[PDB]
Amino acid sequence: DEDTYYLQVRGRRNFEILMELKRSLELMELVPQPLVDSYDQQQQ
Amino acid sequence: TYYLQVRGRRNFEILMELKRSLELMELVPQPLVDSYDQQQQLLQ
Amino acid sequence: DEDTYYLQVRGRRNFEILMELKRSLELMELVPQPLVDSYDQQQQ
Amino acid sequence: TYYLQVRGRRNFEILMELKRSLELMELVPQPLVDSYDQQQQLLQ
């Protein structure tokens, strides 16, 4: 997750949907690794 | 139309797939949308 | 898009987010091919 | 917790990636969430 990309979307609600997911996808990179590995282990 | 920026190739690809689905949904013949939503209300 | 899959999620808002996207992803299969191909052509 | 059902392997995979991001977001140390949201308010 190093390079940045622009995205265009039509529709205010579509924009808000995508922004909520952009936030979650970018924030997940900040979870400390032991917490990620645990989450992933339990999802089995 | 709105812009957003996202960091990371996989994140961009996911968001693009979703953008495509949200915009294509507007091209579905409306009776098929109506049927889909009715079948779902029947279930849930 | 033939087999069906169950998904569990924690959080009412997370559930509503995912349901909105599930709907768009399933509905996009119903767009007539000439409309899909056109949309995809113009996104270049 | 809620269930949903989705038709199609690629659709399931997308929704799973998003479910993971939404649930992992809750494990991010809150000051890092705060910083992220501040940097975004600075921009937009």
> Which residues in chain B have Cβ-Cβ distances shorter than 8 Å to C31?
24, 27-28
Which among B3, B12, B16 is the top mutation candidate for probing chain A, defined by the most A β-carbons within 10 Å of its own β-carbon? B12
Place of tokens 């399933």: C26
| Domain with C32 in it | 1-44
Strand pairing report for C4-9 and A4-9: unpaired
Q: How many structural domains comprise chain C?
A: 1
Tell me the CATH number at D34.
4.10.170.10
Which among C15, C24, C36, C44 is the top mutation candidate for probing chain B, defined by the most B β-carbons within 10 Å of its own β-carbon? C24
How were these coordinates obtained? Answer: X-ray
| One-letter amino acid for residue D40 of the chain | Q
Distance from CA of C12 to the nearest CA of D (A): 8
Largest CA distance in chain B: 40
Extended beta strands in B1-44, E state? 2-7
Contacts of D35 (CB under 8 A, 6+ apart): none
